[PDB]
Amino acid sequence: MLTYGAPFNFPRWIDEHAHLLKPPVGNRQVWQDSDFIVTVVGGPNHRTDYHDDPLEEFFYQLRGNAYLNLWVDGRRERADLKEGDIFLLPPHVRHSPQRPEAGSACLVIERQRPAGMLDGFEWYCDACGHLVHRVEVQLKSAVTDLPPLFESFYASEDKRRCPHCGQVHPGRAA
Amino acid sequence: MLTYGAPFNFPRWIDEHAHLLKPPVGNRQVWQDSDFIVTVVGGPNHRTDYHDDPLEEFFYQLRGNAYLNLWVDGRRERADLKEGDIFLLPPHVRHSPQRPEAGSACLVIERQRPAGMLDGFEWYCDACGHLVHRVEVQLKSAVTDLPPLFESFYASEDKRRCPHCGQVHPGRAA
Ligand SMILES: [Fe+2]
Ligand SMILES: [Fe+2]
Ligand SMILES: [Fe+2]
Ligand SMILES: [Fe+2]
């Protein structure tokens, strides 16, 4: 009845998965088919997408430092995840995590989205701050659901084109 | 829009709350009014109640050692939370956490129960293993909802009386 197995040492698990906690994979989920989505995210990694999570997101930056690019109160903010920091993100706060350091490790906890509760993935214009493109998705497996989403944005100048000032978003790298 | 405040250093937070992570309080919730219930549980503490949580329970034993008394497959099992261990408990697995060490610290993450989804708190007969008493509760604030529940069990020989073999459960301490 211990569907998720017995307790196990977390720092050693992180050490054993260090080759997954770097490009191109970067992150690895701890338990499968659970309501709590428990993930360890490594580095380095940079991204331009902002996530609109309809539920809360918990962060515990166990090793190394990272930071979150955020939209707060209509203003573009930064929240540092220094080593040892914990943080709870409220639903729908747009966030774009940047992880500059190799060997870094962050525990991220989410939970499964019920049917009909959609996740949003957004990009914003560096020139005028307007929203450039949003895709909503019924998230079942981020590891595989999202790479094709991101790739389709990078590949389309039309998706990347700002509707306000016409500036074409750079795509993959800022 | 950062309803739960900015990130902060977790080990230092644990150090600053060490006086709450011991009797009589024992535990302290990190953020209030959040969907994710984030708690740090200290020690020492022993208990005879088993919890029937209708949702999952995540454990990260950061400092010191503890263990969980469990009911697994109709058999009374023990799952050690050695220092550094993480663990995900599936819904409805009956569990009774024992925390023998002072200075220990365990991160426990749950989430709010929707209306109508009840928590159970149970005691079992040491002599024959039968269920002695169960109370169901709409859990809103464990810190204050549950002490009167536990106290009412300790105070009533009738609640503590095993319906199978008549043995009166010892109450507070095993
Ligand atoms: Fe996210
Ligand atoms: Fe623009
Ligand atoms: Fe529990
Ligand atoms: Fe009995």
DSSP B53-120: -SS-EEEEEEES-EEEEEEETTEEEEEEE-TTEEEEEPTT--EEEEB--TT-EEEEEEEPPPTT--EE
Residues of B in contact with A55 (CB under 8 A): 35
Read off the DSSP letter of residue B40: E
Edge to edge, the sheet with strand B66-72 lists B75-81, B66-72, B95-98, B50-52, B119-124, B131-137
Q: Greatest CA separation found in chain A?
A: 57
- CA dist A36 and A56 (Å) reads 11
Size of interface A-B (CB pairs under 8 A): 114
Helix, strand, coil tally for chain B in percent (to 5) = 15, 40, 45
Angle (nearest 5°) at CA A64 between B59 and A120: 70
- CA dist B89 and B68 (Å) reads 10
Ligand of minimum distance to the alpha carbon of B120 = 3
- CA dist B11 and B4 (Å) reads 18
Q: Confirm if B139 and B149 have CB atoms less than 8 A apart.
A: no
Residue at token pair 């040492």: A9
Residue A161 Cα to ligand 2 middle (Å): 8
A128 labelled as ligand-binding?
Answer: yes
**Closest residue of chain A to B67, computed from CA coordinates:** A7
Q: Residues with Cβ < 8 Å from A48, sequence gap 6 or more? A: A96, A123, A169, A170, A171, A172, A173, A174
Q: Is B127 helix (H, G, I), strand (E, B) or coil?
A: coil
Q: Which of B17, B55, B58, B67 to mutate to test the interface with A (most CBs of A within 10 A)?
A: B58
Residues of B in contact with A40 (CB under 8 A): none
Q: Do B86 and A58 touch (CB under 8 A)?
A: no
* Polymer length of chain B: 174
Angle (nearest 5°) at CA A63 between A62 and A65: 105
Residue A152 Cα to ligand 1 middle (Å): 19
Residues of B in contact with A73 (CB under 8 A): 1
Strands A66-72 and A75-81: antiparallel
- CA dist B97 and B75 (Å) reads 16
- CA dist B30 and B13 (Å) reads 9
Residue A147 Cα to ligand 3 middle (Å): 37
Q: Do B7 and A86 touch (CB under 8 A)?
A: yes
Q: Which of A39, A9, A51 is nearest to A109 (CA)?
A: A39
Shortest CB distance from B9 goes to which of A56, A85, A88? A85
Q: Is A51 helix (H, G, I), strand (E, B) or coil?
A: strand
Residue A157 Cα to ligand 1 middle (Å): 25
What's the reported resolution, in angstroms, to a tenth? 1.9
Strands B27-29 and B75-81: unpaired
Shortest CB distance from B7 goes to which of A3, A56, A80? A80
Residue at token pair 């859990």: B139
Q: How many helices (H) and strands (E) does chain A have?
A: 3, 12
User: For the domain A9-174, what is the CATH superfamily, name and number?
Assistant: Jelly Rolls (2.60.120.10)
Ligand of minimum distance to the alpha carbon of B124 = 4
Q: Which of A34, A71, A29 is nearest to B89 (CA)?
A: A34
Q: Is A147 helix (H, G, I), strand (E, B) or coil?
A: helix
- CA dist A155 and A153 (Å) reads 5
